[PDB]
Structure 1
């Protein structure tokens, strides 16, 4: 009969567990290493631009 009240036991329980929110912006969460962030134009180690302007991108 208490099964219908299971939801209560859930929420109350979570009220005592630490919140899982990421601390953005003060403590931004970890994004995936593969995430598709801002494009970036890279250089060779000597400073020359890698972009040859082929327009394939």
Structure 2
């Protein structure tokens, strides 16, 4: 029964097919559009920071991978609309698990997850 040798056909045939490997790093493969890459703090079109420093992103993080501290948007120095902005914002990427709960939490879309990894 040649069936018992079917495997030899599989490997041999795959020899003559073009390898399916993605060419990272020179030609990196396409990540999904929805991929949970690096967090990113976004700005409004006028340049103001979106992050109002509500700490909801940090609140929802299961790994405590976000540390945020808010500060007043004093008229002399305003960074975001409203009366609070995120003065200190740190993500400990050695604690981040890419779960994406932070961006789901953010009420201003200040925090997004880019496809960069």
Mark yes or no: TM-score above 0.5: yes
Larger radius of gyration: 1
Query: What displacement does 1:32 show?
Result: 0.1
Aligned CA RMSD, in angstroms, stands at 0.1
* TM-score, normalised by the number of residues in structure 2: 0.47
* TM-score, normalised by the number of residues in structure 1: 0.96
Counterpart CA distance in 2 for 1:9 and 1:24 is 29
Gaps spanning 5+ residues in structure 2: where? 56-117
Counterpart CA distance in 2 for 1:50 and 1:35 is 22
The answer to whether structure 1 residue 35 and structure 2 residue 24 are counterparts is no
Counterpart of 2:41 in 1: which secondary structure? coil
- Cα-to-partner distance string for 1:3-29 (whole Å, 9 max, x where unaligned): 000000000000000000000000000
How many residues get paired? 55
Counterpart CA distance in 1 for 2:9 and 2:21 is 21
More strand by share: 2
Query: What displacement does 1:45 show?
Result: 0.1
Counterpart CA distance in 1 for 2:45 and 2:31 is 27
Higher relative contact order (CA 8 A, sep 6+): 2
Gaps spanning 5+ residues in structure 1: where? none
Query: What displacement does 1:50 show?
Result: 0.1
- Cα-to-partner distance string for 1:22-54 (whole Å, 9 max, x where unaligned): 000000000000000000000000000000000
